[PDB]
């Protein structure tokens, strides 16, 4: 069933998480929970996403198939307007959530499954494609930049927004369902997460009004409605496209430091691009690189070294637009 | 009317595309969209704001303007 | 806390650092109840308190203003 | 002392005004009241400058030279701040304005009289200083810079136009007292469409006595200047253009209102890759725009009930490393 054409002008690179040991270059791994997609429906509609899963891979697994279903087989492949092609996206995410929900419907090692799947999440990532117009769809903290060659260096913007507990408008959000900013923007961190939107996670979504910090609210504070981003222009770029998942700009900034991350990521796949002859390699190469980069950290230890005990799972996706390989 | 999110949300279907910040998100701060750039209003203090860029945080950018459109600061909560 | 800035010459005054390279006038600015706060290229009506920023080629103090506080009195004539 | 080093990477074009006649080969004139300014201190400071008189010329060759002993003297040469600079130029045309009403304090009388009482005029001044643009402006001259962009020619206008069609001059006028819709309704201000000018002691001192300004705690006609912050000017790659009203007034006349910016600069643009010196590409522009206004007037037809005659047309360049071939 989802077999459908894949894209061939989007390479992926990715690395698993991994911990490190006192004893140094030693690692360890974790059952790994994150997937990407990189279709092409028949009718030339391209479709990407990065899904960043947490407590099981049992979500990622799905949301990724689900959505195809509810994207590629017809409802967006079309003449539509902009609107309308946010609208379509918005009854997709729906539909994997309701669907999702009713899913998780199934020794004393029960209570041990239970806990899991109740726990269960994921965060995603969806770039959509449509005669030169892009589309980010977003729930989470996955990030989406879009690199620009310019006659003056290469442009680099963000296009969406971090849902974590330090925006202004998810705090203003929280707040008109009735909780306290400077409260929750103080925890920082609402059950074990830190993004204030997300798919599945049954626990928070039915039974938020058993959490402290959640108690007083007219509605769910963690919901899993995305944030799309009106159409963009694609006609005379020429660059490329970027979905990358939290544990990579993740990493990376817990080395070199906060901020100035998406230039530097930029700036590395930029080199990269150039010595390299797939798209695959392209990617991976700058995931190999920053895995570098973070266990030398490590090692090679000093002031920054007490911030890279581990990594998650590191996933990125390159789209390229013009930008010459060779 | 616009005291309704849904129908503030309704006045973007015309939104210039390639803008940066996030419709839902502009009318979650209260905000609607007049019809000239990209300039929308406070449906409170009727303050309007423009000329967005990328990395902008509607109710930031509110409290900033306008840094007392009541919506912003809590005096609106129907229940 | 905020008297100083009704008189017009001490909110020019706040000028003095304004960054090189702006459009409008500084005078111009005062002359439409704006005070400099400091960061960038953002004013404050004196009145409404509402800032300004990102101005452009072009633009008219009191044109903006109306448009960003349609009501801050000073530009509804409350002071004269 | 009016002697001091003159620049010599600034052009000057200029052609007096001339009333045409119904019979064609016709071209009249009368006495011309524009005066420039191209000075470089000793210091290696520039100030540039185009005044447009009106009702005599016993001011526009005051202020010109006045205001050069108030600003090449030292006052300004030096590495002072961006406020600082502003505010010499303020103090500048202060110390011209009171000292020239000081100076109108000396039957065929009365005709005189009449004269100096209205006489006036208006400025436009640009001074360098270390690849930094200012800009002091006080009527209606207009003042461009023009930038090579690697997607054209980028123009625009460092000062505003002081008329009753500013939203900005008519609130000021409206704090004072006087009533904006009419005054905006009229247009026009003792013969002067200028909200602000120098000298003219009548609507100075007499404002009162003017049903117009009748209501009136200040000055209606003020001659302060409206300084424009400094302009960064190392990277860039153009021209700097002072005009008279005369001129971007006559262009507007023939082809029609706005545009007029975009076009002289055009044609300025042209003019530069086919002169020798700048000068010539000055005048070549005025000669050019002189042209096409007497032409609409005879091949009259739509526009030419607008071109019955012109006034003094001034134009000053500066070019900031643009090809002159
Ligand atoms: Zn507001
Ligand atoms: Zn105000």
Same mark, same amino acid.
């Given at each position: 069933?989802?077999?459908?054409?894949?894209?061939?002008?989007?390479?992926?690179?990715?690395?698993?998480?991994?911990?490190?040991?006192?004893?140094?270059?030693?690692?360890? =791994?974790?059952?790994?929970?994150?997937?990407?997609?990189?279709?092409?429906?028949?009718?030339?509609?391209?479709?990407?996403?990065?899904?960043?899963?947490?407590?099981?891979?049992?979500?990622?697994?799905?949301?990724?198939?689900?959505? =195809?279903?509810?994207?590629?087989?017809?409802?967006?492949?079309?003449?539509?307007?902009?609107?309308?092609?946010?609208?379509?996206?918005?009854?997709?995410?729906?539909?994997?959530?309701? =669907?999702?929900?009713?899913?998780?419907?199934?020794?004393?090692?029960?209570?041990?499954?239970?806990?899991?799947?109740?726990?269960?999440?994921?965060?995603?990532?969806?770039?959509?494609?449509?005669?030169? +117009?892009?589309?980010?769809?977003?729930?989470?903290?996955?990030?989406?930049?879009?690199? +620009?060659?310019?006659?003056?260096?290469?442009?680099?913007?963000?296009?969406?927004?971090?849902?974590?507990?330090?925006?202004?408008?998810? !705090?203003?959000?929280?707040?008109? !369902?009735?909780?306290?900013?400077?409260?929750?923007?103080?925890?920082?961190?609402?059950?074990?997460?830190?993004?204030?939107?997300?798919?599945?996670?049954?626990?928070?979504?039915?039974?938020?009004?058993?959490?402290?910090?959640?108690?007083?609210?007219?509605? +769910?504070?963690?919901?899993?409605?995305?944030?799309?981003?009106?159409?963009?222009?694609?006609?005379?770029?020429?660059?490329?496209?970027?979905?990358?998942?939290?544990?990579?700009? +993740?990493?990376?900034?817990?080395?070199?430091?906060?901020?100035?991350?998406?230039?530097?990521?930029?700036?590395?796949?930029?080199?990269?691009?150039?010595?390299?002859? =797939? !798209?695959?390699?392209?990617?991976?190469?700058?995931?190999?690189?920053?895995?570098?980069?973070?266990?030398?950290?490590?090692?090679?230890?000093?002031?920054?070294?007490?911030?890279?005990?581990?990594?998650?799972?590191?996933?990125?996706?390159?789209?390229?637009?013009?930008?010459? !390989?060779? | 009317?616009?005291?309704?999110?849904?129908?503030?949300?309704?006045?973007?279907?015309?939104? %210039?595309?390639?803008? %940066?910040?996030?419709?839902?998100?502009?009318?979650?701060?209260?905000?609607?969209?007049?019809?000239?750039?990209?300039?929308?209003?406070?449906?409170?203090?009727?303050?309007?704001?423009?000329?967005?860029?990328?990395?902008?945080?509607?109710?930031?950018?509110?409290?900033?303007?306008? %840094?007392?459109?009541?919506?912003?600061?809590?005096?609106?909560?129907?229940?």
């Amino acid at each position: 069933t989802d077999d459908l054409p894949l894209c061939h002008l989007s390479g992926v690179g990715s690395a698993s998480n991994r911990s490190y040991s006192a004893d140094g270059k030693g690692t360890e =791994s974790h059952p790994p929970e994150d997937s990407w997609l990189k279709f092409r429906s028949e009718n030339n509609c391209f479709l990407y996403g990065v899904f960043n899963g947490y407590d099981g891979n049992r979500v990622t697994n799905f949301v990724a198939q689900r959505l =195809s279903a509810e994207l590629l087989l017809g409802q967006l492949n079309a003449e539509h307007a902009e609107a309308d092609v946010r609208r379509v996206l918005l009854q997709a995410f729906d539909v994997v959530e309701r =669907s999702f929900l009713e899913s998780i419907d199934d020794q004393l090692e029960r209570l041990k499954t239970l806990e899991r799947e109740i726990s269960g999440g994921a965060m995603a990532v969806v770039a959509v494609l449509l005669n030169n +117009k892009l589309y980010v769809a977003n729930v989470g903290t996955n990030r989406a930049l879009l690199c +620009k060659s310019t006659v003056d260096g290469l442009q680099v913007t963000q296009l969406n927004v971090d849902h974590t507990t330090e925006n202004e408008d998810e !705090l203003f959000r929280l707040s008109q !369902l009735g909780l306290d900013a400077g409260k929750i923007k103080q925890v920082g961190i609402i059950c074990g997460q830190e993004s204030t939107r997300r798919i599945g996670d049954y626990k928070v979504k039915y039974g938020y009004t058993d959490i402290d910090l959640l108690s007083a609210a007219k509605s +769910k504070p963690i919901i899993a409605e995305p944030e799309i981003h009106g159409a963009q222009p694609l006609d005379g770029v020429t660059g490329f496209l970027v979905l990358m998942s939290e544990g990579l700009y +993740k990493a990376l900034e817990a080395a070199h430091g906060p901020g100035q991350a998406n230039q530097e990521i930029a700036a590395m796949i930029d080199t990269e691009f150039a010595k390299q002859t =797939s !798209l695959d390699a392209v990617a991976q190469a700058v995931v190999d690189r920053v895995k570098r980069i973070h266990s030398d950290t490590f090692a090679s230890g000093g002031e920054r070294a007490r911030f890279c005990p581990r990594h998650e799972d590191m996933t990125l996706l390159v789209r390229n637009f013009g930008y010459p !390989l060779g | 009317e616009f005291v309704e999110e849904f129908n503030r949300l309704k006045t973007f279907a015309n939104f %210039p595309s390639g803008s %940066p910040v996030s419709a839902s998100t502009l009318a979650r701060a209260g905000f609607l969209y007049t019809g000239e750039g990209d300039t929308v209003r406070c449906f409170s203090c009727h303050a309007a704001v423009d000329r967005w860029q990328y990395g902008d945080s509607a109710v930031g950018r509110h409290r900033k303007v306008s %840094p007392n459109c009541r919506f912003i600061n809590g005096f609106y909560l129907e229940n």
